[PDB]
Design a protein around this ligand. Sequence first.
Ligand SMILES: *[C@H](CC(=O)N1C(=O)C=C(OC)[C@@H]1Cc1ccc(-c2ccccc2)cc1)[C@H](CCc1ccccc1)NC(=O)[C@H](CC(C)C)NC(=O)[C@H](CC(C)C)NC(=O)[C@H](C(C)C)N(C)C
Length: 215
Amino acid sequence: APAAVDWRARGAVTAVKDQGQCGSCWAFSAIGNVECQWFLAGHPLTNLSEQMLVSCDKTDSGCSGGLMNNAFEWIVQENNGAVYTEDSYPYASGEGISPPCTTSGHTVGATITGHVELPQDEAQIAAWLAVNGPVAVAVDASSWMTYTGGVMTSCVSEQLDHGVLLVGYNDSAAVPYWIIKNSWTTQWGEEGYIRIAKGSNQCLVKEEASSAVVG
Ligand SMILES: *[C@H](CC(=O)N1C(=O)C=C(OC)[C@@H]1Cc1ccc(-c2ccccc2)cc1)[C@H](CCc1ccccc1)NC(=O)[C@H](CC(C)C)NC(=O)[C@H](CC(C)C)NC(=O)[C@H](C(C)C)N(C)C
């Protein structure tokens, strides 16, 4: 696989978002993956709805958390493969209450037929992403309140608890790194992003990586 990949540079990544006072990381990770996999299947880049998943997906638990894998399945199985647009189902859980599910008066912005779950291997994950696009991953983020920039290298880690999006990597660098999109606004980290060290399972980045498939 190439030396460096960065799907923002190829127009595949929408702007950084804000989950607010809601534990919906898993929804933003899932959606940001779709947003990008959609685009890379010949469609134009559209902002899609997290609020759809927080409110309507009952396999997960809205602002008290969930996993990306369940979010992909609910889209497919329960919601007929559809993902509404952010515009026709805007995000409304920033104050901390997820308001109730509404099943109509929206607009479908994208569609999926399923998802793959990548093996627990950084290099295979890297290889895949080089070709197929961004990858939703689980990580330990117990200690990211502190993160101001640079390439996180220490990240000792006891469990998975945050969802985010791999959008790239760079193996030339003295410290090789992943490029990860987060949903805590452009204030946090490097304009909303974080680099973590690639090749030592930093923050448990390999452990629960997956992605949607647009048919
Ligand atoms: C999103 C993650 C999140 O937003 N944050 C972090 O993980 C770290 C952050 O800031 C530094 C942000 C905000 C944050 C900060 C601090 C806490 C905290 C602090 C002290 C004690 C408790 C909590 C929480 C969040 C969400 C957060 C879910 C959440 C919301 C409120 C309270 C606790 C947890 N994370 C998830 O949705 C994850 C994402 C997966 C991809 C790993 N999912 C989970 O955490 C599981 C969701 C299930 C399906 C409910 N959790 C579990 O499985 C656990 C384990 C121990 C079995 N269950 C609930 C017991």
